[PDB]
Write a protein that binds this ligand. Structure first.
Ligand code: SF4
Ligand SMILES: [Zn+2]
Ligand SMILES: [Zn+2]
Ligand SMILES: [Zn+2]
Ligand SMILES: [Zn+2]
Lengths: 752, 130, 374
């Protein structure tokens, strides 16, 4: 339906619109016109991807600026969901407008998800795919084949075919999802990865995960193609800080250092062999280094650096190589003694936490190494590997980790902490020392983003309090608000269970996990909700180890046996593919009427992206507050840093972290407004944390339901499910919970 | 078979225990048969592999399978996989010889309401006399 | 940390401290609003209904006193009586889901006594096991095969559980049902089920109003009574056709004679107008020349469905009244706020509330309309 905003038209792809969607669009337009960041929180039940996409596309297709759109998402699954919505929106626009507009849409992703080569695609590791794909497309193989056809070096027909056709004609104009893109590429025998990456400039809207915008390893190349004035949108940004913290981090183990020595020894042997046969290859690169040329100038566009720049692009030094590492052999000695120094520090018998400056000072005192040579460790290693032209890099992969460590620790000095702990797993007979370079400041990685792009839309279904993110992540917001959902009837029934049937308090504290009273009460609670839940029941545990212990106890108690009668039991597992198969079976059981229950982790992989709507989610059971492991060196260091710098209490952040992960799981139950589901927060400590929930979830929570028992919750659930199945009078939601075109026009006139 | 955790070697049975290796081989074959490409909407392997170069901090032991003092697996994951295999076996057995995702994603509540198409007839009350 | 004892006393007596006629009218008007819209939708008078009842562990629940099994069986008896009284030509069959299998308890026939007896026997049977929609639907699909094409296939599942254990893919059965033009009505007992909703919607040409879950004991009877009336048909579906039938004549005989239907001695019967064979009771297919014998009354009972009487509209209070007494029953309209007079549009004659319900539920012809001379 064509409905207008202050000065532009919007083509919503549905005959009727929610009141929340219109308000959400109006605020987004206000932010775009005024500019600056904004934190919006729309209810998960109301459609949000469709509303946001419809407005932004209309904004660029109408205004003279024709600004591009960058749409970020947590995971790949979200990218495909958004892409499907975008294509549906485009189809509606073409029909109403008659002519298909000059619009292009793609989505960046790793090589593994797009590779079509029969051999490389079969690889189980994304990095292994990159190594094989680069080998066939580095350009060395093609040049060698041209020089001597007798050479047996293989190529990739998919990559070669792209050369014949121009870049602007790789794909027909329109929106290309991963499924559609793969189908077209397979028919035309082309590589989706290169087509998608090479078309970033042409695309009007580009959809890719946060790791393609905050991780400098795979962001510096992409960030150069996107336009500066593009609109940036962060969808489901309630966990963005974790990505920023996890981008500039690194962990080194004893095995990593052992392989580093092996790689360095192999590197020295290879250099000697290359020197014997022909030393002219090294001389040419040495002359370039003296001239001051860096990897960017030396390496061609087709080739890629062996070690991706671990530090942010702006922090990389621009001066020439120091000289101590100019020669091939001198750098090897520099690399060797650096590795030995790390091995020495692994022998500490107690936890030692120190700043990067102290680590550098001690390093220099023992083995003479300065800050500046370390900053060029990653760059120099890539050049040396390229010069040696090693066909196989299986051994040298270890040196990559060491090179990353040197640059990270020699570039940043504030906001990072180096922690060495002799016991990685406390429950280990023999210590396995591990040294962690952890990032404490979540704003270091996102600082370039906010400085580059003028307008950023930070939106998420479950994101609260909105005042924390501006504090935790240093940025200012012109507008920030949360929208309450105008619903005709109570679509969701949140409840905070604090006691079992026997009136005994229940909590998921990790130190009393093996408590028969707590274990049995959760077991009885799971069975009772399985008896009354029609099709789907999702259970979220605080940690995977907690899930294992509880399930094992339930099996001995025989509680799972009673569950098997009513529902199939699917459990999340560390293997990613097996979990995907479990989800497929869980969905099938819900759809065919058999009924299934999914046991997963609140802070696991299933919670980030998989939406359990309509029949899939009819009851969500939260077994305990998903608290983080308090006795963790990384968490303690971050909390101390945050308290001293951003003035956030340790307890406040821990509650904030736990509640965000519980809220996101709760919000996956609802897709629309007709969908209904019962949310259960089974823990004693949830009683006093109602105010910390998202506003729309809190509004549905009642004082009576703030402290409930298993018996009361089951009786309450039975009545709710029975009521929600009855037909609803259209007049009740005719013009309050849903708006037709006439209702929207009437509301607009009333405002004026 | 019933998912009970395998306690320390008990009496068991001399003869039946010899088939444990065959049973494990059958389970591996069944797992291979069950494994198949998954719809990209719900695929989780791509999500973890969407950033192949990420090497952030390793998660604490609370986010990893339990391990013993010697470092061997606790064994709880084995029974959990059995539950998944049993459920998958049941669901797959149902489907015996005897654009789709796009429709599901669309929000139905905002679509036009279903309209009945019942026929109407007006009979003529003009019949011949006896 | 004081307890609730120390706070105060509840003081229950403090809580208690010290227009109906118009409310009834407006409530009636709101209820009458749903009855305002009525059009002569074409409905299939001849029908074949397979009644599927859930007899599983879920029936042992005490939600419906004494137990779900007892109330469902008892109301089934009433439904059988009502179904065969409103629709005399229709045939019915009974299936029950028990022990994970669909068990046939009465062949599809047109004799209400057989179905009533079958339900009576099921009374003592104790429900157990899990229900199986696919097994019941597959059995129902087979039962509705011999039925003539002109008959409208119908399935009325009374589902009580929340989970279904099937041996195969139930989605295939749903597609098969649509191919055979079978419409399924499901009366859930506890909560909505994804498969049940899909089955009703797919088989009812996308209509989602054929899956209903009750909310109390009283609502169950209304749901059972609603299924008695025939269902409308869609425009696209075509089943127009003629059916050969005859009207036999009751014959009185001094000496009893053998009946062709049951081969039993009966004093009287109906002689077929084609083969002269005698049949004990009507309406049933002739045992010899397989033409459905019926009386003119059986056809008459279904006429009111074809041409329903238009709903009456309450007269405004301001406007004058035709007379001070009801036209039909001569009951004075109470003087009372709002006049309690209802007039038929065609003949413009006021009626009382008692007549309004009677003239649209039991009596199917407006007294004034017949009195009016054309
Ligand atoms: S060029 Fe494309 S198809 Fe060929 S190996 Fe690389 S990712 Fe795979
Ligand atoms: Zn007889
Ligand atoms: Zn006959
Ligand atoms: Zn009267
Ligand atoms: Zn009349």
């Amino acid at each position: 339906m064509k409905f207008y905003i202050d000065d532009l038209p919007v083509l919503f792809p549905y005959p009727k619109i929610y009141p929340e969607q219109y308000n959400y669009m109006c605020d987004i337009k206000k932010t775009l016109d005024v500019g600056g960041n904004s934190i919006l929180e729309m209810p998960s039940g109301t459609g949000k991807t469709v509303s946001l996409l419809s407005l932004t596309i209309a904004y660029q297709m109408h205004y003279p600026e024709h600004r591009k759109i960058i749409y970020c998402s947590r995971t790949m699954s979200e990218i495909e969901k958004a892409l499907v919505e975008l294509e549906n929106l485009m189809d509606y626009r073409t029909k109403e407008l008659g002519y298909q507009e000059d619009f292009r849409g793609l989505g960046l992703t790793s090589r593994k998800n797009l590779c079509l080569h029969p051999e490389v695609s079969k690889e189980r590791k994304g990095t292994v795919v990159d190594e094989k794909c680069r080998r066939m497309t580095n350009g060395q193989a093609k040049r060698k084949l041209e020089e001597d056809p007798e050479a047996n070096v293989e190529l990739c027909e998919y990559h070669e075919n792209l050369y014949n056709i121009e870049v602007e004609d790789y794909l027909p104009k329109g929106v290309f999802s991963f499924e559609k893109l793969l189908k077209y590429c397979e028919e035309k025998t082309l590589c989706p990865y290169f087509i998608v990456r090479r078309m970033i400039s042409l695309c009007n809207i580009i959809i890719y995960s946060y790791h393609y915008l905050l991780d400098p390893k795979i962001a510096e190349r992409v960030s150069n193609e996107v336009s500066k004035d593009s609109i940036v949108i962060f969808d489901e940004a309630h966990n963005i800080d974790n990505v920023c913290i996890e981008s500039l981090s690194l962990d080194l183990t004893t095995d990593a250092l052992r392989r580093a020595t092996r790689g360095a020894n192999a590197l020295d042997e290879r250099i000697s062999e290359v020197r014997k046969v022909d030393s002219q290859k090294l001389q040419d690169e040495y002359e370039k280094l003296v001239q001051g040329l860096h990897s960017a100038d030396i390496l061609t566009d087709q080739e890629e650096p062996f070690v991706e720049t671990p530090v942010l692009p702006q922090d990389l030094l621009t001066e020439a190589i120091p000289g101590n590492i100019r020669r091939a052999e001198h750098f090897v000695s520099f690399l060797k003694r650096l590795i030995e120094y790390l091995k020495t520090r692994m022998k500490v018998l107690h936890v030692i936490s120190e700043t990067p400056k102290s680590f550098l000072q001690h390093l220099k005192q023992l083995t003479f190494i300065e800050r500046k040579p370390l900053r060029f460790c990653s760059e120099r290693l890539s050049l040396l590997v390229r010069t040696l032209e090693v066909t196989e890099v299986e051994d040298f992969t270890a040196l990559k980790d060491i090179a990353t460590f040197a640059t990270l620790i020699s570039t940043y000095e504030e906001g990072f902490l180096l922690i060495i702990e002799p016991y990685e797993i406390e429950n280990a007979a023999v210590p396995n020392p591990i040294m962690r370079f952890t990032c404490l400041d979540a704003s270091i990685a996102i600082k370039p983003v906010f400085e580059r792009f003028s307008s950023v839309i930070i939106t998420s279904g479950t994101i609260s309090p909105l005042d924390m993110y501006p504090r935790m992540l240093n940025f200012k917001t012109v507008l920030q608000k949360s929208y309450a959902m105008t619903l005709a009837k109570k679509s969701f029934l949140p409840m905070i269970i604090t006691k079992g049937s026997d009136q005994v308090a229940i909590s998921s504290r990790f130190e009393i996990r093996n408590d028969p009273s707590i274990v049995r009460n959760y077991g009885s609670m799971l069975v009772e909700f399985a008896k009354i839940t029609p099709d789907g029941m999702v259970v979220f545990f605080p940690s995977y180890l907690y899930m294992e212990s509880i399930v094992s106890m339930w099996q001995t108690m025989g509680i799972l046996d009673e569950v098997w009668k009513h529902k199939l039991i699917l459990v999340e597992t560390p293997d990613a593919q097996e979990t995907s198969l479990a989800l497929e079976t869980y969905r099938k059981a819900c759809s065919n009427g058999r009924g299934a229950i999914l046991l997963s982790v609140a802070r696991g992989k299933v919670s980030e992206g998989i939406d359990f709507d309509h029949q899939y989610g009819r009851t969500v059971l939260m077994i305990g507050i998903p608290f983080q492991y308090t006795e963790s060196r990384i968490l303690k260091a971050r909390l101390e840093f945050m308290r001293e710098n951003y003035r956030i209490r340790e307890n406040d952040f821990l509650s904030f972290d736990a509640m965000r992960h519980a809220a996101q799981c709760l919000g996956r139950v609802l897709r629309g407004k007709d969908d209904y589901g019962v949310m259960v927060l089974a823990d004693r400590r949830f009683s006093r944390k109602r105010s910390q929930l998202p506003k729309w979830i809190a509004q549905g929570l009642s004082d009576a339901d703030l402290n409930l028992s298993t018996d009361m919750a089951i009786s309450n659930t039975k009545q709710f499910l029975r009521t929600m199945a009855q037909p609803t009078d259209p007049k009740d939601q005719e013009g309050v919970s849903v708006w037709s075109y006439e209702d929207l026009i009437k509301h607009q006139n009333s405002r004026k | 078979l019933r998912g009970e955790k395998i306690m320390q070697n008990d009496r068991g049975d001399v003869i039946i225990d010899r088939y444990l290796t065959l049973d494990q081989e059958f389970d591996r074959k069944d797992d291979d048969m069950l494994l198949h490409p998954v719809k990209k909407i719900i695929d989780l392997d791509g999500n973890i592999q969407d950033d192949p170069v990420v090497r952030g901090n390793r998660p604490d032991f609370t986010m990893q399978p339990g391990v013993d003092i010697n470092g061997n697996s606790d064994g709880t994951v084995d029974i959990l996989k059995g539950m998944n295999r049993l459920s998958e076996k049941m669901i797959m057995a149902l489907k015996n010889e005897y654009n789709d995702e796009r429709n599901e994603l669309k929000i139905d509540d905002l679509n036009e309401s279903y309209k009945t198409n019942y026929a109407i007839i007006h009979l003529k009350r003009n019949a011949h006399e006896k | 940390g004081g307890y609730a004892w120390e706070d105060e006393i509840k003081r229950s007596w403090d809580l208690v401290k010290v227009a109906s006629l118009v409310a009834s009218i407006v409530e009636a008007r709101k209820k009458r609003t749903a009855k305002k819209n009525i059009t002569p939708y074409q409905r299939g008078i001849i029908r074949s209904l397979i009644l599927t009842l859930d007899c599983s562990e879920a029936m042992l629940e005490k939600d419906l006193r004494p137990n779900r099994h007892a109330m469902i069986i008892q109301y089934a008896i009433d439904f059988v009586h009502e179904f065969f009284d409103q629709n005399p030509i229709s045939q019915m069959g009974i299936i029950i889901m028990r022990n994970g299998l669909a068990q046939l308890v009465s062949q599809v026939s047109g004799n209400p006594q057989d179905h009533i007896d079958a339900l009576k026997s099921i009374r003592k049977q104790e429900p157990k096991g899990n229900p199986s929609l696919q097994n019941a639907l597959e059995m129902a699909r087979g039962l509705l095969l011999p039925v003539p094409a002109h008959c409208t296939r119908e399935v009325l599942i009374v589902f009580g559980s929340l989970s279904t254990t099937d041996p195969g893919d139930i989605h295939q059965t749903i597609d098969s049902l649509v191919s055979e033009k079978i419409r399924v009505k499901v009366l859930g007992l506890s909560a909505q089920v994804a498969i049940c909703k899909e089955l009703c919607k797919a088989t009812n040409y996308g209509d989602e109003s054929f899956y209903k879950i009750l909310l109390d004991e009283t609502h169950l009877k209304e749901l059972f009574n609603e299924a008695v009336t025939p269902l409308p048909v869609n425009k696209i579906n075509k089943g127009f056709t003629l059916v050969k039938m005859g009207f036999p004549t009751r014959i009185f005989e001094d000496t009893p004679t053998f009946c062709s239907c049951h081969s039993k001695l009966v004093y009287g019967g109906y002689f077929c107008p084609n083969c002269h064979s005698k049949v004990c009771s009507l309406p049933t297919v002739c045992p010899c020349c397989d033409l459905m014998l019926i009386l003119s009354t059986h056809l008459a009972r279904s006429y009111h469905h074809l041409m329903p009487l238009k709903t009456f509209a309450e007269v405004p209070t301001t406007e004058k009244f035709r007379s001070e007494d009801c036209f039909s029953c001569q009951s004075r309209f109470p003087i009372l706020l709002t006049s309690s007079r209802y007039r038929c549009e065609d003949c413009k004659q006021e009626f009382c509330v008692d007549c309004d319900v009677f003239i649209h539920e039991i009596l199917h012809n407006c007294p004034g309309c017949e009195s009016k001379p054309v």
